[PDB]
Amino acid sequence: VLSEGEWQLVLHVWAKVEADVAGHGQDILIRLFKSHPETLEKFDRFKHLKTEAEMKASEDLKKHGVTVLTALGAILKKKGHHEAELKPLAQSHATKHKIPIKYLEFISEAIIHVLHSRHPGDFGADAQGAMNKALELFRKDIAAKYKELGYQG
Numbered sequence: 001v002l003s004e005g006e007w008q009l010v011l012h013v014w015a016k017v018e019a020d021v022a023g024h025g026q027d028i029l030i031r032l033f034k035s036h037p038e039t040l041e042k043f044d045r046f047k048h049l050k051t052e053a054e055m056k057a058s059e060d061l062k063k064h065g066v067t068v069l070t071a072l073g074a075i076l077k078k079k080g081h082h083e084a085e086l087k088p089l090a091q092s093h094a095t096k097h098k099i100p101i102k103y104l105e106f107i108s109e110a111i112i113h114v115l116h117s118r119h120p121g122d123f124g125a126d127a128q129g130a131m132n133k134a135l136e137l138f139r140k141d142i143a144a145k146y147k148e149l150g151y152q153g
Protein backbone atom coordinates (compact mmCIF):
# COMPACT_ATOMS: atom_id res chain seq x y z
CA VAL A 1 0.00 0.00 0.00
CA LEU A 2 1.40 3.45 -0.72
CA SER A 3 1.15 6.31 1.75
CA GLU A 4 -0.36 9.57 0.52
CA GLY A 5 3.19 11.03 0.67
CA GLU A 6 4.49 8.23 -1.56
CA TRP A 7 1.62 8.87 -4.02
CA GLN A 8 2.71 12.55 -4.10
CA LEU A 9 6.35 11.57 -4.86
CA VAL A 10 4.91 9.57 -7.81
CA LEU A 11 2.78 12.49 -9.01
CA HIS A 12 5.60 15.03 -8.57
CA VAL A 13 7.93 13.14 -10.96
CA TRP A 14 4.91 12.51 -13.26
CA ALA A 15 4.42 16.28 -13.63
CA LYS A 16 7.94 16.39 -15.09
CA VAL A 17 7.07 13.48 -17.41
CA GLU A 18 4.15 15.54 -18.64
CA ALA A 19 6.45 18.43 -19.63
CA ASP A 20 7.87 16.13 -22.36
CA VAL A 21 5.56 13.18 -22.84
CA ALA A 22 6.89 12.26 -26.30
CA GLY A 23 10.56 12.39 -25.29
CA HIS A 24 9.97 10.23 -22.21
CA GLY A 25 7.87 7.80 -24.33
CA GLN A 26 10.61 7.38 -26.97
CA ASP A 27 13.25 6.83 -24.31
CA ILE A 28 11.10 4.25 -22.51
CA LEU A 29 10.22 2.32 -25.66
CA ILE A 30 13.78 2.35 -27.09
CA ARG A 31 15.10 1.06 -23.73
CA LEU A 32 12.48 -1.72 -23.75
CA PHE A 33 13.03 -2.75 -27.36
CA LYS A 34 16.81 -2.88 -27.02
CA SER A 35 16.69 -4.67 -23.62
CA HIS A 36 14.02 -7.11 -24.79
CA PRO A 37 13.92 -7.22 -28.62
CA GLU A 38 11.06 -9.75 -28.88
CA THR A 39 8.64 -7.13 -27.39
CA LEU A 40 8.94 -5.12 -30.64
CA GLU A 41 7.31 -8.03 -32.53
CA LYS A 42 3.95 -7.02 -31.04
CA PHE A 43 3.85 -3.83 -33.18
CA ASP A 44 2.98 -4.46 -36.82
CA ARG A 45 3.24 -0.78 -37.71
CA PHE A 46 6.90 -0.51 -36.68
CA LYS A 47 8.36 -3.97 -35.90
CA HIS A 48 10.99 -3.59 -38.66
CA LEU A 49 12.81 -0.68 -36.93
CA LYS A 50 16.35 -1.72 -35.99
CA THR A 51 18.62 1.19 -35.24
CA GLU A 52 18.24 3.77 -32.56
CA ALA A 53 18.09 6.41 -35.35
CA GLU A 54 15.14 4.61 -37.01
CA MET A 55 13.40 4.34 -33.62
CA LYS A 56 13.87 8.04 -32.89
CA ALA A 57 12.62 9.03 -36.32
CA SER A 58 9.43 6.90 -36.26
CA GLU A 59 6.13 8.69 -35.84
CA ASP A 60 4.37 5.41 -35.00
CA LEU A 61 6.83 4.70 -32.19
CA LYS A 62 6.51 8.30 -30.90
CA LYS A 63 2.68 8.09 -30.97
CA HIS A 64 2.69 4.72 -29.19
CA GLY A 65 4.98 6.18 -26.40
CA VAL A 66 2.46 9.02 -25.94
CA THR A 67 -0.44 6.50 -25.85
CA VAL A 68 1.30 4.51 -23.12
CA LEU A 69 2.09 7.49 -20.96
CA THR A 70 -1.29 9.31 -21.45
CA ALA A 71 -2.92 6.16 -20.08
CA LEU A 72 -0.38 5.51 -17.34
CA GLY A 73 -0.59 9.15 -16.04
CA ALA A 74 -4.38 8.85 -15.83
CA ILE A 75 -3.99 5.57 -13.87
CA LEU A 76 -1.38 7.01 -11.46
CA LYS A 77 -3.48 10.08 -10.67
CA LYS A 78 -6.19 7.67 -9.36
CA LYS A 79 -3.71 6.70 -6.63
CA GLY A 80 -4.67 3.04 -6.78
CA HIS A 81 -8.45 3.66 -7.11
CA HIS A 82 -8.16 2.69 -10.80
CA GLU A 83 -10.45 -0.28 -11.70
CA ALA A 84 -12.37 1.84 -14.24
CA GLU A 85 -9.18 2.79 -16.10
CA LEU A 86 -7.75 -0.69 -15.93
CA LYS A 87 -10.86 -2.49 -17.17
CA PRO A 88 -10.63 -1.45 -20.93
CA LEU A 89 -6.83 -1.86 -20.84
CA ALA A 90 -6.86 -5.44 -19.46
CA GLN A 91 -9.58 -6.16 -21.98
CA SER A 92 -7.47 -5.33 -25.06
CA HIS A 93 -4.26 -6.66 -23.57
CA ALA A 94 -5.81 -10.07 -22.77
CA THR A 95 -8.07 -10.57 -25.78
CA LYS A 96 -6.33 -8.73 -28.63
CA HIS A 97 -2.71 -7.67 -28.08
CA LYS A 98 -2.00 -10.70 -25.74
CA ILE A 99 0.62 -8.97 -23.65
CA PRO A 100 2.25 -11.38 -21.15
CA ILE A 101 2.72 -10.28 -17.50
CA LYS A 102 6.52 -10.65 -18.07
CA TYR A 103 6.32 -7.93 -20.75
CA LEU A 104 4.47 -5.63 -18.28
CA GLU A 105 7.42 -6.22 -15.93
CA PHE A 106 9.91 -5.40 -18.73
CA ILE A 107 8.33 -2.02 -19.54
CA SER A 108 7.98 -1.19 -15.78
CA GLU A 109 11.78 -1.66 -15.52
CA ALA A 110 12.24 0.64 -18.55
CA ILE A 111 9.99 3.36 -17.03
CA ILE A 112 11.94 3.31 -13.75
CA HIS A 113 15.28 3.38 -15.67
CA VAL A 114 14.31 6.44 -17.80
CA LEU A 115 12.75 8.37 -14.89
CA HIS A 116 15.92 7.88 -12.89
CA SER A 117 18.20 8.85 -15.87
CA ARG A 118 16.16 11.94 -16.66
CA HIS A 119 15.38 13.10 -13.12
CA PRO A 120 18.19 11.99 -10.73
CA GLY A 121 17.91 15.22 -8.69
CA ASP A 122 14.68 14.07 -7.16
CA PHE A 123 13.87 10.55 -8.29
CA GLY A 124 15.71 9.08 -5.26
CA ALA A 125 15.19 5.82 -3.35
CA ASP A 126 11.85 6.92 -1.90
CA ALA A 127 10.36 8.12 -5.15
CA GLN A 128 11.79 5.09 -7.01
CA GLY A 129 10.33 2.79 -4.32
CA ALA A 130 6.95 4.55 -4.55
CA MET A 131 6.90 4.27 -8.40
CA ASN A 132 7.94 0.61 -8.13
CA LYS A 133 5.00 -0.05 -5.75
CA ALA A 134 2.50 1.83 -7.95
CA LEU A 135 3.60 -0.14 -11.11
CA GLU A 136 3.55 -3.36 -9.10
CA LEU A 137 -0.04 -2.56 -8.05
CA PHE A 138 -0.86 -1.79 -11.70
CA ARG A 139 0.55 -5.15 -12.81
CA LYS A 140 -1.17 -6.92 -9.91
CA ASP A 141 -4.57 -5.66 -10.95
CA ILE A 142 -4.06 -6.19 -14.69
CA ALA A 143 -2.95 -9.79 -13.95
CA ALA A 144 -6.05 -10.40 -11.81
CA LYS A 145 -8.26 -9.26 -14.68
CA TYR A 146 -6.26 -11.36 -17.20
CA LYS A 147 -6.91 -14.45 -15.10
CA GLU A 148 -10.63 -13.60 -14.84
CA LEU A 149 -10.72 -13.33 -18.63
CA GLY A 150 -8.82 -16.63 -18.86
CA TYR A 151 -5.63 -15.18 -20.42
CA GLN A 152 -2.67 -17.01 -18.85
CA GLY A 153 0.05 -14.94 -20.58
Ligand SMILES: C=CC1=C(C)/C(=C/c2[nH]c(/C=C3N=C(/C=C4\NC(=O)C(C)=C4C=C)C(C)=C\3CCC(=O)O)c(CCC(=O)O)c2C)NC1=O
Pocket residue numbers: 039040042043045064067068069071072088089092093097099103104107
Ligand atom coordinates in the same frame (compact mmCIF):
# COMPACT_ATOMS: atom_id res chain seq x y z
C1 LIG B 1 2.28 0.94 -18.26
C2 LIG B 1 2.23 0.30 -19.55
C3 LIG B 1 1.34 0.49 -20.61
C4 LIG B 1 0.13 1.14 -20.70
C5 LIG B 1 -0.63 1.89 -19.58
C6 LIG B 1 -0.31 0.97 -22.11
C7 LIG B 1 -1.49 1.48 -22.67
C8 LIG B 1 -1.99 1.23 -23.97
N1 LIG B 1 -1.43 0.33 -24.86
C9 LIG B 1 -2.23 0.41 -25.99
C10 LIG B 1 -2.08 -0.40 -27.11
C11 LIG B 1 -1.17 -1.45 -27.29
N2 LIG B 1 -0.31 -1.89 -26.30
C12 LIG B 1 0.49 -2.83 -26.95
C13 LIG B 1 1.58 -3.46 -26.35
C14 LIG B 1 2.01 -3.43 -25.02
N3 LIG B 1 1.27 -2.94 -23.96
C15 LIG B 1 2.04 -3.22 -22.85
O1 LIG B 1 1.62 -3.15 -21.71
C16 LIG B 1 3.33 -3.79 -23.19
C17 LIG B 1 4.44 -4.05 -22.17
C18 LIG B 1 3.33 -3.93 -24.55
C19 LIG B 1 4.34 -4.37 -25.42
C20 LIG B 1 5.37 -5.36 -25.17
C21 LIG B 1 0.10 -3.02 -28.34
C22 LIG B 1 0.62 -4.02 -29.37
C23 LIG B 1 -0.90 -2.13 -28.56
C24 LIG B 1 -1.52 -1.84 -29.92
C25 LIG B 1 -0.69 -0.82 -30.70
C26 LIG B 1 -1.33 -0.39 -32.01
O2 LIG B 1 -2.17 -1.25 -32.77
O3 LIG B 1 -1.16 0.76 -32.46
C27 LIG B 1 -3.32 1.37 -25.81
C28 LIG B 1 -4.41 1.76 -26.81
C29 LIG B 1 -5.83 1.30 -26.47
C30 LIG B 1 -5.91 -0.21 -26.32
O4 LIG B 1 -5.44 -1.10 -27.28
O5 LIG B 1 -6.40 -0.71 -25.30
C31 LIG B 1 -3.16 1.88 -24.56
C32 LIG B 1 -4.06 2.94 -23.91
N4 LIG B 1 0.60 0.23 -22.84
C33 LIG B 1 1.59 -0.03 -21.93
O6 LIG B 1 2.68 -0.48 -22.25
